[PDB]
RNA sequence: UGCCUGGCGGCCGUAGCGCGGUGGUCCCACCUGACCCCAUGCCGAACUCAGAAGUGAAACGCCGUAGCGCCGAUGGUAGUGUGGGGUCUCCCCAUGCGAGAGUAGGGAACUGCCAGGCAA
RNA sequence: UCCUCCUAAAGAGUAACGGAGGAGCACGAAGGUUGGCUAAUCCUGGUCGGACAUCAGGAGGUUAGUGCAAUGGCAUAAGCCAGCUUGACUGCGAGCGUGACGGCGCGAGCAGGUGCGAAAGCAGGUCAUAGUGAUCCGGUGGUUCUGAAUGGAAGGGCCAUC
RNA sequence: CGACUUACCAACCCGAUGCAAACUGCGAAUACCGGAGAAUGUUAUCACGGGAGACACACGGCGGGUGCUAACGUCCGUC
């Protein structure tokens, strides 16, 4: 199962970040509408979220679910986090290879202020 | 598809004795001569 | 001569015979021999009792043995000093607690059943009583 | 041909639930991981659990496998 | 105990060396690990020797 | 690829009408094919493995991989991790052209032909079979090879049972004697 | 506020399996192609990129069903600390603690944060 | 002498010429990190091929595996595969466990300089528990520390090691 | 090349019954460790210093190994 394999892949990282006790930037990727979220160390609340599923961010990019979409979401999370106040975060692959859209989102985020 | 590890997969035209001709991509080589095919055979 | 096959260990501790019997009810036949006393039965005693009943019933009915030795017992050879390791295994015994059902039987009249069990109990070292299958 | 034995390794729980410990103190000595490290608890190379911070030690059961965890709260 | 002990000598002029073991029967070639030399306080190549 | 269009043209409709499914994807469809060659005699002469792999590359469109023993068994004098066979799995587009070569030029050229078997089903919808000799495929000239070893074929589909798998294969004008 | 959907958790079998039904407005999945990014100890299988035709088949979510797993009393029993007694290789009395298995029964979940669509 | 289980009486420890077995290693990778993967046993179809080689599907959920006997542990895998590598590093070390002692074990963290990863991070050998021998005497390399009138040297000391 | 029966051997499973120091999907009483509190006890506790003796134990109860659930036997745990 794709989901079961993915959860098994990301379990070690999630546990490592959980015991470390640090805010983590978690990204969920699908064939469309790449998501992104910021989670408190306790893991119970979401500091801020962004994605291409809402019209506020989906009204510019031609198509959601590409490199451009990842950069927009990656950038979008940036100023939101900077405005909120949190600066340092830990990136979570969530079992997605850090190659394409995931890398583009992270690259946009780190260059936008969320260094990690 | 890995490179320079697979045999050449060029197209080649083959015809049999009963007048049926078809194009197939394979590793047969330069030319091929057949006598029977799916049809025109006592299957 | 009941005996296990390829037991895990050749020797085992003496242990104790405290407690109370578990298989206290008739489960297979209609009549059974219940153990009143406490002790151990060797393989030879079980065989002797079994032969006594089979002859008594004249190979009529069914016989169930509800006890297995599954416990080796050692014995030092004569003129041997204490120590120098555990003794060699000699015979196998089954620990019996009060209420244990030794043998079960079915397919014979109650009258003939009583004498058959009485003959067997005469060749056992523990007080025994006759019981009948109960309804629930 | 018997008569051989090994010196006892004095394993077991050294600090029990609800008693304060200092950082670096050994909590549990074990061969495997009968108890898993929780919060402010580190695991040694020999699966020894030691306190990474000062506080009260507590035991709990967590996870889908109901495996036992040892944590420390700064109290 | 076929495995025998060797000495790893720093490529630098310093006389510092490490000591280890290896099996000459299976891996007869020299050992060229890159280790830390405290006399010069740098990581340098260490060569196998007696 | 030509039969893939043929499959997409009316075979899907033929499957649709006969089973009158609710949807279109319910119809069984092939996803991959697998070629096996359990040579077994690697112990006697491991050198022949390379050429045994080579011919499979002649029939197939890609390089085979050599499989290793799952475990060591004393009855066969094989140790764990020892190559004792090769296989090939082909899917996507290349499977279709190979399927042509099997169904058009290969089956008719069977020595002492009697008819393709119809009971060779695993019980779930997957078909398997074997061949005596390589010359059935045109890629053997009878002079560059001197071995009698054969090979095995296996086509797997999304069928939930044998009845639709057999029906789907029948749509591909299989002999099934 | 409600029916829904996705993510991150709490909690961990009353939460898990089996059978039947139900879902495509969004979301999700399958799905087309892959020259380029990326990968196959061979394969667009898996991973990754460019897409959205088609579909709810499979998977996933929800509902129903006890067919299983699971939870589970009260009472009794076994054992047992302390103090006494006996026909003392085992038991009994006073007091304290009190199982395991089984039985009646329960049971096919609950809950926090964020984001999106519909009705409000 | 050392290691594992039981005896051992639910903390630790606990004897017998009591009941069972092992060790005097191995590995420059079988170590470090990054990425990925998940067995045994059965059922059905299929050339040699046959109960037992390899392929496909299904039940199964770890009965597999874990370099070596046993116990405990291991899906975040400690199990299996691949890339890059030498942290199997130097000086320390709060605080603990264990011993009559000699001693043995665990260890966050600090300084220096490295490897893997985009990064958070991990790495002071190996899933852990056996694979080991005090002191004396002497050998090898470094270090003006000392060097008995002075300058050297011999010989000692210190450090690494046999 | 289809295929069939059985008075006869029997695997794996299902239902019932047992056993185990080196079996555990369960699990006490006691004991042990830590914290708070009252009363009581000539500090009964710990650390350091001076001086010792002792390191042949025996029986009884309870939990065991060994022996024959023999020994005023032998070897351990606790009183």
Curated annotation (Swiss-Prot), chain B:
Result of altering residue 18 to S: Binds Zn(2+) normally
Record GO terms (molecular function): rRNA binding; structural constituent of ribosome; zinc ion binding
Any one GO biological process: translation
UniProt KW keywords: Acetylation, Metal-binding, Ribonucleoprotein, Ribosomal protein, RNA-binding, rRNA-binding, Zinc
Intrachain S-S bonds: none
Processing after translation: Proteolytically cleaved by protease VII to yield a peptide lacking residues 63-70. It is not clear if this is due to protein degradation or is a bona fide processing event in the strain used in PubMed:339950 and PubMed:10556732. In strains B, D10, MRE-600 and Q13 the only protein seen in PubMed:10556732 was full-length; the last 7 amino acids were sequenced only for strain MRE-600.
Signal peptide: none
Gene Ontology cellular component annotations, sorted alphabetically: cytoplasm; cytosol; cytosolic large ribosomal subunit
Free-text remark on how the cofactor is bound: Binds 1 zinc ion per subunit. Only 1 ligand appears to be Cys, the other are thought to be His and either backbone amides or solvent.
N6-acetyllysine modified-residue sites: 8
Effect of residue 16 to S: No Zn(2+) binding
Binding-site residues, Zn(2+): 16
Essential cofactor(s): Zn(2+)
Record note on quaternary structure: Part of the 50S ribosomal subunit.
Family affiliation: Belongs to the bacterial ribosomal protein bL31 family. Type A subfamily.
This protein's name: Large ribosomal subunit protein bL31
Shown chain mapped onto the complete sequence: 1 to 43 of 70
Swiss-Prot record, chain D:
InterPro entries, per database record: Ribosomal_bL27 (IPR001684), Ribosomal_bL27_CS (IPR018261)
Superkingdom, natural source: Bacteria
Record's keyword terms, sorted: Ribonucleoprotein, Ribosomal protein, RNA-binding, rRNA-binding, tRNA-binding
UniProt record, GO biological process: assembly of large subunit precursor of preribosome; cytoplasmic translation; cytosolic ribosome assembly; positive regulation of ribosome biogenesis; regulation of cell growth; ribosomal large subunit assembly
Stretches assigned to coiled coil: none
GO cellular component labels: cytoplasm; cytosolic large ribosomal subunit
SUPFAM superfamilies per UniProt: Ribosomal L27 protein-like
Molecular-function GO terms, alphabetical: ribosome binding; rRNA binding; structural constituent of ribosome; tRNA binding
Assembly: Part of the 50S ribosomal subunit. Cross-links to the 23S rRNA. Cross-links to the A and P site tRNAs.
Family that this chain belongs to: Belongs to the bacterial ribosomal protein bL27 family.
Protein known as: Large ribosomal subunit protein bL27
Organism in which the protein naturally occurs: Escherichia coli (strain K12)
Swiss-Prot record, chain E:
Cellular component annotations (GO), alphabetically ordered: cytoplasm; cytosol; cytosolic large ribosomal subunit
Coiled coil regions, renumbered to chain: none
Keywords attached to this entry: Methylation, Ribonucleoprotein, Ribosomal protein, RNA-binding, tRNA-binding
InterPro entries to which the protein is assigned, alphabetical: Ribosomal_bL33 (IPR001705), Ribosomal_bL33_CS (IPR018264), Ribosomal_bL33_sf (IPR038584), Ribosomal_zn-bd (IPR011332)
Pfam families (alphabetical): Ribosomal_L33
Molecular function (Gene Ontology), one example: structural constituent of ribosome
Other facts: Surface exposed on the 50S subunit.
Subunit-level organization: Part of the 50S ribosomal subunit. Cross-links to the P and E site tRNAs.
Stored NCBIfam families: PRK00595.1 (NF001860), rpmG_bact (TIGR01023)
Stated name of the protein: Large ribosomal subunit protein bL33
Record organism: Escherichia coli (strain K12)
UniProtKB/Swiss-Prot annotation, chain F:
Record's keyword annotation contains rRNA-binding: yes
Listed InterPro entries: Ribosomal_uL5, Ribosomal_uL5_bac-type, Ribosomal_uL5_C, Ribosomal_uL5_CS, Ribosomal_uL5_dom_sf, Ribosomal_uL5_N
Pfam families linked to this entry: Ribosomal_L5, Ribosomal_L5_C
Modification sites for N6-acetyllysine: 2
Top-rank taxon, per record: Bacteria
Any one GO CC term of the record: cytoplasm
PROSITE patterns hit by this protein: RIBOSOMAL_L5
Keyword Ribonucleoprotein listed: yes
MF terms (GO), sorted A to Z: 5S rRNA binding; RNA binding; structural constituent of ribosome; tRNA binding
Subunit structure of this chain's protein: Part of the 50S ribosomal subunit; part of the 5S rRNA/L5/L18/L25 subcomplex. Contacts the 5S rRNA; cross-links to the P site tRNA. Forms a bridge to the 30S subunit in the 70S ribosome, contacting protein S13 and S19.
Similarity field: Belongs to the universal ribosomal protein uL5 family.
General remark: Identified as a multicopy suppressor of the slow growth phenotype of an rsgA (yjeQ) deletion mutant.
Entry-linked PANTHER family: 60S RIBOSOMAL PROTEIN L11-RELATED
Annotated protein name in UniProt: Large ribosomal subunit protein uL5
Gene that this polypeptide is encoded by: rplE
